[PDB]
Write a protein that binds this ligand. Structure first.
Ligand SMILES: CCCCCCCC/C=C\CCCCCCCC(=O)OC[C@H](O)CO
Ligand SMILES: CCCCCCCC/C=C\CCCCCCCC(=O)OC[C@H](O)CO
Ligand SMILES: CCCCCCCC/C=C\CCCCCCCC(=O)OC[C@H](O)CO
Ligand SMILES: CCCCCCCC/C=C\CCCCCCCC(=O)OC[C@H](O)CO
Ligand SMILES: CCCCCCCC/C=C\CCCCCCCC(=O)OC[C@H](O)CO
Ligand SMILES: CCCCCCCC/C=C\CCCCCCCC(=O)OC[C@H](O)CO
Ligand SMILES: CCCCCCCC/C=C\CCCCCCCC(=O)OC[C@H](O)CO
Ligand SMILES: CCCCCCCC/C=C\CCCCCCCC(=O)OC[C@H](O)CO
Ligand SMILES: CCCCCCCC/C=C\CCCCCCCC(=O)OC[C@H](O)CO
Ligand SMILES: CCCCCCCC/C=C\CCCCCCCC(=O)OC[C@H](O)CO
Ligand SMILES: O=C(O)CN(CCN(CC(=O)O)CC(=O)O)CC(=O)O
Ligand SMILES: O=C(O)CN(CCN(CC(=O)O)CC(=O)O)CC(=O)O
Lengths: 247, 247
């Protein structure tokens, strides 16, 4: 029984809504098939938990978004008049660190993780924390928290780059290196889009609507989560296939 | 310019307010002196970054709480009528993982971290995510998210226990083991209090007021952050002092 004009602002156009709904179905369907494929491998082979955990969270998230995107607590309706997509940011904290853990052991071989991994993980959690806080903020305080996100974010990209470069030199000279390069390209483009979409969305300058932001986020979600995971899985398969033959 | 009855509910009694304000000063003062002490060691000795990073965040957080506890985005005022202490939960995501990273290398000696560390870190981030979401939630959905927090939380405590036990056997037989036991006692009591305070506070059954919850949280913050860090530092010092003499 609380009233605010901002909570009733348009969520976007019907086309954007329909586009958004359509991409949820695709995301879900693609996630189920990936989950089936990974589960199929777990029984008949070895499969990293990172690919599976991330994909299960992604499947659940699109289902939850489809039904509850605009209901609390998946969207927060603040006394500032603004609406914060908490489901978006919550999901990042669950999935992004696991992706970075996957990135710290690209070959799947080692049991150990370096000091780089810790610095990488800490900087990414902070990035999300600052970004979420910025979305909740109002006025110039919003710009300050976004800047902290960029600082933490730059640290994450820096460490990530190093992991990719060390990974490139660590993997064997043929297809494996081509795959690592593909993973790096896919990673930096998709991860780079997130801050861009933030600026363009309601939390930023409101160029995009809620539905419009959702459309864009679902595409880069598929890129960063499902596709990158599938590539990383394929890389791990190649490493296994190579070591048997070449030792 | 939005109206809601819940946003204007009492924050607590004047005694609770005053108690809360007093503990902020103590927390800040204690954090500054610890920061000075750690900084003093960095120039004149070796000092782990975990103790320092955590303490710097804690000093900043109490300063921010003192001035801005009830201002957005440090408190979220939701269309549900409820007020969510986002500053509390944001701070946990920044500091708790670093504490667990410290816990994964108690002796300060190794450069590597095991698969336990990753599982420990992932489960703790999730715990906070579910807990924060529960605080934002309303009705029975709140109970479901809290349960997910307990599941993730139990996993964290399980792995933490193992780290403590392996750490106990790894450290030398005298004072070092006594210190690890002290750290474990301090850790489980302080960490266990968080879910208890959550239930007792406004986000739970509202036995405690906002100020009352703040009082309790500041005490366990000092226990879990500053004191546990100081003990962990002391342990690392003992390991160093022992290895020179005993190899
Ligand atoms: C995949 C790439 C782009 C998705 C296409 C984005 C779809 C853009 C939706 C906007 C639109 O087409 O507007 C019509 C609207 O229904 C009139 O009110
Ligand atoms: C998995 C990702 C979970 C994110 C937390 C956000 C949870 C969003 C839950 C929405 C449920 C609502 O239900 C009330 C009507
Ligand atoms: C080749 C020049 C491209 C022009 C700019 C395109 C837009 C920015 C994309 C950056 C991702 C860079 C990925 C780096 C690949 C690592 C190589 C191993
Ligand atoms: C650089 C990114 C900083 C992020 C901050 C973007 C906020 C822009 C903004 O709020 O301006 C629009 C106007 O206030 C109507 O909503
Ligand atoms: C390089 C790969 C990046 C793709 C970014 C995703 C594309 C973003 C699509 C935005 C479409 C929107 O338009 C709807 C409009 O706001 C009406 O409500
Ligand atoms: C340190 C341990 C406990 C702190 C003491 C907690 C302080 C409790 C405050 C409640 C109180 O004393 O109430 C008086 C109030 O001002 C009348 O309106
Ligand atoms: C370090 C812990 C940061 C937590 C994020 C919460 C940030 C809370 C910032 C409050 C600032 C307000 O200022 C507007 C008047
Ligand atoms: C000794 C019996 C105590 C009675 C119950 C007290 C309340 C619960 C406290 C649990 C922390 C347990 C810490 C375990 C110490 C690890 C030993 C190494
Ligand atoms: C077990 C913890 C579950 C946490 C959920 C606690 C919520 C209790 C509650 O809301 O009841 C009070 C009443 O609704 C007036 O505010
Ligand atoms: C074992 C160590 C645990 C200490 C828990 C901290 C103690 C919690 C103190 C709660 C005091 C409150 O009382 C204020 C009341 O709500 C009026 O507004
Ligand atoms: O099947 C349909 O008609 C579409 N869905 C989704 C419609 N959504 C709007 C949206 O998110 O696009 C309803 C809602 O989220 O409240 C129905 C439903 O959620 O029961
Ligand atoms: O010095 C004082 O009088 C106390 N502080 C704190 C008073 N607080 C209330 C509280 O949090 O206890 C003011 C506020 O947070 O708005 C003054 C100030 O913030 O400028």
């Amino acid at each position: 029984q609380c009233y605010c004009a901002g909570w009733i602002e348009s969520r976007g156009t019907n086309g954007a809504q329909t586009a958004s709904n359509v991409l949820q179905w695709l995301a879900a369907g693609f996630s189920i098939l990936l989950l089936m494929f990974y589960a199929y491998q777990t029984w008949k082979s070895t499969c990293g938990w990172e690919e599976i955990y991330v994909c299960a969270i992604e499947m659940v998230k699109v289902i939850l978004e489809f039904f509850f995107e605009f209901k609390n607590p998946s969207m927060l309706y603040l006394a500032t008049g603004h609406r914060v997509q908490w489901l978006r940011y919550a999901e990042w904290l669950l999935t992004c660190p696991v992706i970075l853990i996957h990135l710290s052991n690209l070959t799947g071989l080692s049991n150990d993780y370096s000091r780089r991994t810790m610095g990488l993980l800490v900087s990414d959690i902070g990035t999300i924390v600052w970004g979420a806080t910025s979305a909740m903020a109002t006025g110039y305080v919003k710009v300050i928290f976004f800047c902290l996100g960029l600082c933490y974010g730059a640290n994450t990209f820096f460490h990530a780059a190093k992991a990719y470069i060390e990974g490139y030199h660590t993997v064997p000279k043929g297809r494996c290196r081509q795959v690592v390069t593909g993973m790096a390209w896919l990673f930096f483009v998709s991860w780079g889009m997130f801050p861009i979409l933030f600026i363009l969305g309601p939390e930023g300058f409101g160029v995009l609507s809620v539905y419009g932001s959702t459309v864009g986020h679902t595409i880069i979600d598929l890129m960063s989560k499902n596709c990158w995971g599938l590539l990383g899985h394929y890389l791990r398969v190649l490493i296994h296939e190579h070591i048997l033959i070449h030792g």
